[PDB]
Design a protein around this ligand. Structure first.
Ligand SMILES: COCC(=O)Nc1c(C)cc(C)cc1C
Length: 186
């Protein structure tokens, strides 16, 4: 099936816990995969205008590890629950992708999660201004704009709203699309 095929591809890129103990400032992100209308989509958040870092920008759910978290996957799930109301029984964490190094002292660990078909997002307005889906295939032929620095523009055909996706978020989206969609019979 489509979902069994996705998880089997993703598992080949799992680095597991190999880099998780190193002494960094630690953050995790959840890359949430949703099946709709026969195809896979990624779920994104628009950050609230009130936040200090990157107000109004597109990112994946996530945040800073705290002393309650059992492991880095726990950080990503705690934060996803707080931001969009995703409950633990509604996500299967399939793997841990390559971590992102920034600012010389920070390590961001990305997890890919498969989302239950009955989940519906409940954006928390203190943290999240908007939630939207993008079909995974978009990231193989994006609409690119140069600010020189590459920015993707995605327009939702439901309502005509345009979103800008850039930086680490855009880089991880492309990576997941390659893993799952490369070399597939039609
Ligand atoms: C200080 O925590 C780091 C951070 O960026 N947090 C955060 C992230 C990652 C995503 C969303 C949607 C909302 C928040 C508050």
């Amino acid at each position: 099936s489509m979902l069994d095929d996705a998880k089997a591809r993703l598992r080949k890129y799992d680095i597991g816990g190999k880099y998780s103990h190193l002494p960094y400032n630690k953050y995790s992100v959840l890359l949430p995969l949703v099946a709709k209308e026969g195809k896979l989509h990624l779920l994104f958040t628009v950050r609230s205008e009130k936040l200090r870092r990157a107000p109004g920008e597109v990112c994946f759910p996530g945040g800073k590890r705290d002393p309650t978290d059992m492991d880095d996957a726990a950080t990503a799930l705690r934060e996803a629950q707080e931001e969009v109301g995703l409950r633990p029984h509604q996500v299967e964490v399939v793997c841990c992708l390559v971590p992102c190094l920034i600012d010389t002292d920070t390590l961001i660990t990305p997890f890919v999660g498969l989302i239950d078909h009955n989940f519906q997002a409940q954006p928390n307005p203190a943290e999240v201004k908007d939630v939207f889906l993008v079909p995974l295939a978009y990231f193989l032929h994006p609409q690119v704009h140069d600010q020189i620095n590459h920015i993707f523009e995605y327009t939702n055909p439901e309502d005509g709203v345009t979103y800008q996706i850039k930086g680490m978020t855009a880089n991880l989206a492309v990576l997941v699309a390659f893993i799952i969609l490369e070399k597939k019979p039609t």
